[PDB]
Amino acid sequence: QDPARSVRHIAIPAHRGLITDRNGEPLAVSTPVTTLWANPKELMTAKERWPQLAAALGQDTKLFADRIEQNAEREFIYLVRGLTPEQGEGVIALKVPGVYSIEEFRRFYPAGEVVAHAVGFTDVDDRGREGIELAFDEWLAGVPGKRQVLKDRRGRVIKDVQVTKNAKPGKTLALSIDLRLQYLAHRELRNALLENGAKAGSLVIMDVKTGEILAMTNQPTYNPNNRRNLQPAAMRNRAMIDVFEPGSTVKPFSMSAALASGRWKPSDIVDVYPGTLQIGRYTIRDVSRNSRQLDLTGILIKSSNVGISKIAFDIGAESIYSVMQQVGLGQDTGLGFPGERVGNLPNHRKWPKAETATLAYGYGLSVTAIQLAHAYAALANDGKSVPLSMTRVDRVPDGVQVISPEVASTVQGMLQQVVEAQGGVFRAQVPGYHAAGKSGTARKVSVGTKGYRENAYCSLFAGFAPATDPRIAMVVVIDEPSKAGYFGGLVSAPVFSKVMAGALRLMNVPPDNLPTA
Numbered sequence: 001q002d003p004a005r006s007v008r009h010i011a012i013p014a015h016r017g018l019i020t021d022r023n024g025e026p027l028a029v030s031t032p033v034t035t036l037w038a039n040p041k042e043l044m045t046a047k048e049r050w051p052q053l054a055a056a057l058g059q060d061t062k063l064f065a066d067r068i069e070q071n072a073e074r075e076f077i078y079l080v081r082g083l084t085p086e087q088g089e090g091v092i093a094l095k096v097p098g099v100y101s102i103e104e105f106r107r108f109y110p111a112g113e114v115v116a117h118a119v120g121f122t123d124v125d126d127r128g129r130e131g132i133e134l135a136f137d138e139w140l141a142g143v144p145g146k147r148q149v150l151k152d153r154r155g156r157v158i159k160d161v162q163v164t165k166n167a168k169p170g171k172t173l174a175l176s177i178d179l180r181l182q183y184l185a186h187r188e189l190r191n192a193l194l195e196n197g198a199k200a201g202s203l204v205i206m207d208v209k210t211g212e213i214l215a216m217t218n219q220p221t222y223n224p225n226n227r228r229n230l231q232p233a234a235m236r237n238r239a240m241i242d243v244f245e246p247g248s249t250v251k252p253f254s255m256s257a258a259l260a261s262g263r264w265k266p267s268d269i270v271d272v273y274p275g276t277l278q279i280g281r282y283t284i285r286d287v288s289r290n291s292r293q294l295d296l297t298g299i300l301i302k303s304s305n306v307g308i309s310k311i312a313f314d315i316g317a318e319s320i321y322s323v324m325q326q327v328g329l330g331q332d333t334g335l336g337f338p339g340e341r342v343g344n345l346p347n348h349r350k351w352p353k354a355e356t357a358t359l360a361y362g363y364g365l366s367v368t369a370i371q372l373a374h375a376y377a378a379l380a381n382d383g384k385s386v387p388l389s390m391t392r393v394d395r396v397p398d399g400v401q402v403i404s405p406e407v408a409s410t411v412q413g414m415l416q417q418v419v420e421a422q423g424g425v426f427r428a429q430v431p432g433y434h435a436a437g438k439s440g441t442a443r444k445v446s447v448g449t450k451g452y453r454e455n456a457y458c459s460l461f462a463g464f465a466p467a468t469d470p471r472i473a474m475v476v477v478i479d480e481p482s483k484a485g486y487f488g489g490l491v492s493a494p495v496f497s498k499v500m501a502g503a504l505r506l507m508n509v510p511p512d513n514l515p516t517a
């Protein structure tokens, strides 16, 4: 009986779609590779050739011979996947019976580590594994073809009957990222990390008018063309997967809820003396404690938890929760890519006072840097939230009004004072422009469950520019800076300054800090 003939179907591998940046710079490029395979049934008739084949493949003579012997009844085995066509030619040139070529594709990432977390990469089979490669795998992958062949009793092809399905290439995908801004960001987050002996960080740049991610970089990073060094940590797209308590960076949202309540205007006053406020067993504390009356701007400039807490008791936590939720903090109303974390916004039917105050000044919730950037974009875009995109946006979808335009404009001008006023975050100033934002510094949650660590910090700055016609929102998050000065305004705000400056200049944004004309 046995088998004199077989009909089988072998794949025609398809060309995966080019990934570019928003200007057509290649970021992921399908590269011709040569996969060597062999038919053991045919190899078995030419043993005298095996040693020169094993040497060609960098394999021990005996272990190779053992492998072939052990698979003598099979018709297919991989020798090696993914060598260059030049190297596959070197093995093919030996003319060993039963050794064959498949012309395949494998990815190359020309920007390497610079954009590795955003682009992601493919597995051994050329299917998306992380990032864009995975999120847009159906678009990029295309469909492999199918060829019907006739085969004899030892797996040798007698004839190509027909192509049953044509291979169709995957489609080109242009990201929203500008590789020039991405590089700038990369380099400046890298430098600040090193300068501060920090463990990790992220930076996200968004177009506030289009919802586009113009840049997304994290440290540590890795070279996606050589993933031998293997370290899982370095592969984390922290901007999208690592949640943190945003601390004082959410105070502009609490303030938007105050302004919207009917009960507060910027020039109203809060008594924050003596810099602490007891709430049953918990004490709210400010870092600087030489204040009494502060106006609402001043509460943001000095970053008083007490002042923001007293506002929150007056307007109620529900209003603050609603703002945070509407801007996307702890919500799944972002990109929603595979692997992305949502974080968490605590909810209560009856908010106790401690939870009300902590929410208002940014603890008891957890958000990602992308969320925080998107929230800042909505504030900067006169309270309108344009849907997030990682792909180039030619037709901008409709924004949703999440904060009233007047409230958003009032809070903008407060955040510009936070940067520009005496006692403010002067290091966030952007030469040429008016900039606006908010610093944050949060003690990290103690690892073995519990509470907080007195040694370890997350250093934040979030903002936008130009303050008077906003274009760009940006978040800089630096995890465990290790020097004397660890405050957001020392650590993160200068990175904001430099990367915002570069980005506005790259985008030809006209200066708006000009003598009053």
Ligand SMILES: CCN1CCN(C(=O)N[C@@H](C(=O)N[C@H](C=O)[C@@H]2N[C@@H](C(=O)O)C(C)(C)S2)c2ccccc2)C(=O)C1=O
Pocket: 246, 247, 248, 249, 284, 285, 286, 287, 302, 303, 304, 305, 358, 363, 439, 440, 441, 442, 443, 452, 487, 488, 489
């Ligand atoms: C729920 C308990 N629990 C947990 C953590 N915790 C907390 O981490 N506190 C930080 C804080 O108060 N940060 C504020 C907003 O981030 C202010 N803004 C900073 C900035 O602008 O850089 C600042 C000027 C350094 S103070 C803090 C305290 C001390 C030093 C640096 C930062 C609390 O307070 C708090 O109650």
